[PDB]
Amino acid sequence: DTLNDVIQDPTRRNKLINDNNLLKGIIMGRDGPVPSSRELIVRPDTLRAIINNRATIETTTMEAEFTETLMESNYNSASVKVSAPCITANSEYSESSSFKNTETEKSMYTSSRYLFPQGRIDFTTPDSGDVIKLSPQFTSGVQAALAKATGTEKREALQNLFQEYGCVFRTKVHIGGVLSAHTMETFSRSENETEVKQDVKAGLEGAVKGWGGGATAGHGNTQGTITTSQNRKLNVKYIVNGGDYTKIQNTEEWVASTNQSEHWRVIEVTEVTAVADLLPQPIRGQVKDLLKPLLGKWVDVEKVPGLESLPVSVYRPKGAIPAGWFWLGDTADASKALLVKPTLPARSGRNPALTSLHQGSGMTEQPFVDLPQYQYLSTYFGSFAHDTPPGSTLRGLRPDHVLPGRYEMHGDTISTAVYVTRPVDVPFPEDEAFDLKSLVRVKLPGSGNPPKPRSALKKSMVLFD
Ligand SMILES: [Cl-]
Ligand SMILES: [Cl-]
Ligand SMILES: [Cl-]
Ligand SMILES: [Cl-]
Ligand SMILES: [Cl-]
Ligand SMILES: [Cl-]
Numbered sequence: 127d128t129l130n131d132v133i134q135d136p137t138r139r140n141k142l143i144n145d146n147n148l149l150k151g152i153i154m155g156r157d158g159p160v161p162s163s164r165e166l167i168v169r170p171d172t173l174r175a176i177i178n179n180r181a182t183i184e185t186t187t188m189e190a191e192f193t194e195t196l197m198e199s200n201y202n203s204a205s206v207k208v209s210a211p212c213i214t215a216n217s218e219y220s221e222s223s224s225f226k227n228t229e230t231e232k233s234m235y236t237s238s239r240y241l242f243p244q245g246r247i248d249f250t251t252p253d254s255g256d257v258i259k260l261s262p263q264f265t266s267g268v269q270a271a272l273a274k275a276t277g278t279e280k281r282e283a284l285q286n287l288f289q290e291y292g293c294v295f296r297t298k299v300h301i302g303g304v305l306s307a308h309t310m311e312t313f314s315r316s317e318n319e320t321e322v323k324q325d326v327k328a329g330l331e332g333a334v335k336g337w338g339g340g341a342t343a344g345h346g347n348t349q350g351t352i353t354t355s356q357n358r359k360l361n362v363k364y365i366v367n368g369g370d371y372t373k374i375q376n377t378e379e380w381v382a383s384t385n386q387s388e389h390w391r392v393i394e395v396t397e398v399t400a401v402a403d404l405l406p407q408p409i410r411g412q413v414k415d416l417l418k419p420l421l422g423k424w425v426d427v428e429k430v431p432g433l434e435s436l437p438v439s440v441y442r443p444k445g446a447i448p449a450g451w452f453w454l455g456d457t458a459d460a461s462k463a464l465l466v467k468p469t470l471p472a473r474s475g476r477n478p479a480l481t482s483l484h485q486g487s488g489m490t491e492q493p494f495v496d497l498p499q500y501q502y503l504s505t506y507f508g509s510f511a512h513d514t515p516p517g518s519t520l521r522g523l524r525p526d527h528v529l530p531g532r533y534e535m536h537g538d539t540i541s542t543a544v545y546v547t548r549p550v551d552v553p554f555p556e557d558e559a560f561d562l563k564s565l566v567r568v569k570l571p572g573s574g575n576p577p578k579p580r581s582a583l584k585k586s587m588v589l590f591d
Pocket of ligand 5: 500501576577578579
């Protein structure tokens with residue numbers, strides 16, 4: 127009946143907590159977001175709730191790759207944001223993804239959800255408050271991991287802990303029923319981004335409005351095609367959550383079932399908190415430091431010879447590179463270069479932080495990532511070979527490690543012109559990036575060259591001292 131009653135009655139409420147896995151952390155993987163089999167927090171006898179019967183249509187637009195299953199799970203932008211690094215790191219990479227970001231093309235996900243809510247449930251973060259308590263078993267696993275003797279053993283234990291419990295926990299969820307449509311769009315960079323985003327959003331919102339309004343043929347989960355006002359053909363995935371699915375073929379009956387508590391499910395993930403952030407200091411900081419996939423070391427550099435025609439000097443770390451450490455590309459930094467070292471051992475099924483590189487088969491001397499979808503920061507000034515220094519110690523990066531950078535172009539002629547990559551200079555960045563002055567050649571000879579880097583390394587991924 128009413129949501130307020132549910133929270134009161136322990137049996138109605140526990141069915142709500144259990145059927146929706148509200149105590150479970152979320153595991154990100156190749157198939158998407160999966161509830162842990164273990165409970166992460168202590169079960170409360172009552173839930174913080176905010177009543178809302180107001181049906182609305184919301185729309186989320188997303189340019190971040192690897193987030194499609196989260197979009198289909200009705201995560202909002204903020205929830206996708208927090209969850210992005212985890213799912214990116216745990217995704218199954220491939221060279222043949224329909225999602226494509228190139229020099230000419232750009233892709234994005236758009237999801238529209240017709241909500242039929244009953245309210246929103248919030249789990250208070252430690253800053254009370256109603257405050258949640260981490261499970262004794264979980265906080266035990268943490269203590270045990272931190273009690274290990276060597277760094278690797280500590281980190282390896284933390285990974286198992288998080289692989290088991292999950293990387294994020296849903297701290298705010300809406301419940302009820304939902305009819306949602308999800309699509310991906312790939313478009314030329316020569317198009318107006320605003321126009322494409324509004325055009326897709328309008329077409330997708332119109333589709334779900336007709337669905338939940340009862341003006342279109344009723345239907346459950348299925349795939350289809352819609353056409354925008356600008357004649358864009360979109361492949362759409364329709365998803366239903368909550369309510370009685372046996373009644374979905376008749377939309378209005380479906381909507382009526384939304385008022386039945388037995389059929390309420392999560393219809394939107396509104397806020398997500400990284401599990402580690404549920405920890406009190408200084409345990410929180412110890413874990414997060416250990417979780418960092420790379421160690422960092424600033425070393426001196428040396429100018430590269432053969433680059434007198436170039437508008438700037440090119441620098442590489444001064445040999446010899448300490449064994450087990452790697453560099454990330456030619457820089458214009460004459461003072462220091464960053465070396466990195468992976469903190470986690472390579473294991474089958476695990477996406478390593480770094481990838482080695484190999485020279486292209488075509489008419490190019492530029493490196494290509496061995497591992498699909500991995501990224502590097504600089505063009506290679508010279509001829510790359512994986513078996514010869516310094517290319518032998520050069521490494522690419524797992525996609526979660528990088529953000530888009532920005533070019534500062536130098537040169538009086540294109541053929542010698544270079545881009546110097548800086549962190550993006552938006553005033554309030556969510557993820558802070560290293561300034562590495564990664565060097566990118568403006569025009570490369572000749573086609574067969576890999577896509578041009580414009581990336582910056584996240585500081586949150588590198589552990590110092
Ligand atoms: Cl899914
Ligand atoms: Cl709570
Ligand atoms: Cl469901
Ligand atoms: Cl190749
Ligand atoms: Cl690249
Ligand atoms: Cl840019």
